[PDB]
């Protein structure tokens, strides 16, 4: 967006759009210290079942302990995650393969992140 | 929370866990008044108010006995009722009669002590350590989504 401190969020959360490629931002912050949050955002659970099958092909491309950055990816995703307490932004990338529209998908890959960075705040109250 | 909590968590939750009919609770706590909590949640018209992964939803000619047409990827679509809309003792329950989807019998009791009880005809022709975990997580996200939208935190 142009956050409070988009500084390590810069090169990362900056993703290239495309003709089929997409991406978006988030608002979820925590008041427990940041390194106490990183703690949990470092140990690779949050398929979720539902549909008959469930596949993924994930991979780590960035790991930064000193400044706090872990970039997920697929084998298209390219999730990036950043940080009196702490902030936690979010962004990713994706595909609209014939079958839907961005206002279902990026709102199908949107709604989950809140339910993933919301899971993180409970575990570090405030 | 605690043990003086049956006030309306008796005549509801004390409920028929039959043979293939499972259920489970939900630890959640919000710093707004239960009245402030209730308004956000009361809204059965739009479940979107706070409930996740939903899509557009209508009704039938909100009320007690008036059906709705919520819908959620590939395919699946949910059709519910509102057996109980108790507005004084914060309680909503609603069954998914006339649904399109797999997961069978339902009566999602959301009472406020803030707890959501779910029931699922134990079999979707599948496991049981998954039927609970598939939904109980779905449940999880929503009440967590309930919390956010009111200034609990």
Author numbering:
A (entry chain C): 37 to 80, 84 to 85, 111 to 139, 147 to 154, 160 to 202
B (entry chain A): 37 to 97, 101 to 111, 115 to 154, 163 to 203
Sentences from the paper on this structure:
A 13-member family of ABA receptors PYR/PYL/RCAR (PYLs) in Arabidopsis thaliana was genetically and biochemically identified. Upon binding (+)-ABA, dimeric PYLs underwent a pronounced conformational rearrangement, and then bound and inhibited the group A protein phosphatases type 2Cs (PP2C), including ABI1, ABI2, HAB1 and PP2CA. PYLs/PP2C heterodimer blocked substrates binding to PP2Cs, and thus released downstream transcription factors SnRK2 kinases formerly inhibited by PP2C.
PYL5 and PYL9 represent two extremes of recognizing (−)-ABA. However, the X-ray diffraction data showed that it was highly twinned and could not be merged together. Nevertheless, the apo-PYL5 structure was solved at a resolution of 2.68 Å.
